[PDB]
Amino acid sequence: QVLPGAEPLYSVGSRIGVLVSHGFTGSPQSMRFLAEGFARAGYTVATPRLTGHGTTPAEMAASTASDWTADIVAAMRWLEERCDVLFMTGLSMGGALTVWAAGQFPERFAGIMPINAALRMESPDLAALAFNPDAPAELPGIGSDIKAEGVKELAYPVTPVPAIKHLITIGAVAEMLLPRVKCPALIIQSREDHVVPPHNGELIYNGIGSTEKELLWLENSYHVATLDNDKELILERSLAFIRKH
Amino acid sequence: LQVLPGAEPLYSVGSRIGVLVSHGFTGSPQSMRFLAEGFARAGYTVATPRLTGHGTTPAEMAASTASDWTADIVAAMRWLEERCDVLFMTGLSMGGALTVWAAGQFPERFAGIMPINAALRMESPDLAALAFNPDAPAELPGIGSDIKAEGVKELAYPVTPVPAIKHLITIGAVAEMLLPRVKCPALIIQSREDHVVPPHNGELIYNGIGSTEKELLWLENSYHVATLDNDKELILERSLAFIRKH
Ligand SMILES: [Cl-]
Ligand SMILES: [Cl-]
């Protein structure tokens, strides 16, 4: 059973496609505005629901980084059916999957837009839960770090402790893949972010092999930027980035 | 399954002070045997485990994970705690990343650690592109015996099983992120020249741990599998010295 509001978005338009990925404990709700923005400009758009997300925390507890990378591949194949040119964007772990897909399939994307990508969590407490034989099954949730007032994210209200190692793994693999990324990149990072360190944007800008790259700092959003004050700016810049690459 | 000849674990019961000795990815206890026997002849209780999927077949290793390997280190820690009041841990490559992981994960538990050429950051795009690759082969060419001393052989698999690669990187990253939590005394042993794991890994550890007592020992005459190499004697001697003094 899919929680209401967490369903995936598949829209068919032109032969230019965009893959949009949400992050860890979240769902396609956090990406909907953006996804809709691209479909409305006429692009084909795949915004998958990642395995164990938008259902229950227990399901997520049993999900892995192999599932999630397979979800991105499956969405790339859906786009390659409909499309000649692909872009990918994503929030947080979705932004790490974006970097991962572009390093993994270096010739396949015309461009990427990672947003607050979670390559390095830099958290000793989080690392101390990855393989803790004495840890609770769940902690309090990671959701709704948003500057704009009265705005809600559909995400689990808790963090499933067995899934934590898989977040850290996707980030690590994406960081090591950075020099293999060569497509144009628009790296969007919140200047203040209380979930993923802002330095991740510099990390990406400084490590990729792309010759065409820009680091765009968001001044009016925290972590969930795609639902925040800068959501419209993200859409505008990303539409211009698509149009020009 | 049958354990390969030479790949048997080493367990030795001795005093109230114990040492957990961990080998690395595609390797086996044989690469740690010289060190482990040394600590046992000195009278210490010694656990040198055979990691899940290792010293059997590359197919069994393909089915083994980082949850398996950290659970192996946890059970060796439990075996030592039954027999011992004080614990140390040492290990080579992924076993040295596991040594960092256990000292960060259980910060009061160890009196000291000696990671050797610890594999926290492989810094290899080619490896990272095998981690979740839907088109990769089942096996690659092996990583075994990067050894400066001529003639010396390591008992490690002759191939790298591709699916196990994601777990190597996971352990290294979790260890790296735990570094500020490592507080016990540390002897970080690193080969100055290493064709497997970047040498800068020793600096990374030295600079990131919270330990007030720490030493970086650079090995001038060994490559990666230093526990088998020209500097093996120096490593045993300084590790025994480190144990007596902490
Ligand atoms: Cl995330
Ligand atoms: Cl290793």
Author numbering:
A (entry chain A): 35 to 279
B (entry chain C): 34 to 279
Give the text the authors published on this PDB structure.
Here, we have used metagenome-based technologies to identify and characterize novel bacterial lipolytic enzymes which catalyze both hydrolysis and esterification reactions at temperatures above 70°C. Metagenomic libraries from enriched soil and water samples were constructed and screening revealed two novel lipases designated LipS and LipT which showed a high temperature optimum and also a high stability against thermal denaturation. LipS assumes the fold of a classical α/β hydrolase. The active site of LipS is formed by the catalytic triad S126, D227 and H257 with the catalytic serine located at the sharp γ-turn between β4 and αD.
After refinement, the active site of LipS-WT in SG P4 contained strong residual density immediately adjacent to S126 and H257. This density was interpreted with spermidine. Spermidine was used as an additive to improve crystal quality and was subsequently shown to inhibit the activity of LipS with its substrate pNP-decanoate in concentration dependent manner. The terminal amino-group of spermidine comes remarkably close to both S126 and H257 when the secondary amid group interacts with D187, which lines the end of the active site cavity. Thus, it is likely that spermidine mimics substrate bound in the active site. The conformations of the inserted domains in all four LipS molecules found in one asymmetric unit were identical. Furthermore, data that the inserted domain assumes the same conformation with and without bound spermidine in structures of LipS suggests that this is rather a rigid structure. Identical conformations of the lid-domain, which covers the active site, in the absence and presence of a ligand, indicate that this domain may not undergo conformational rearrangements during the catalytic cycle.
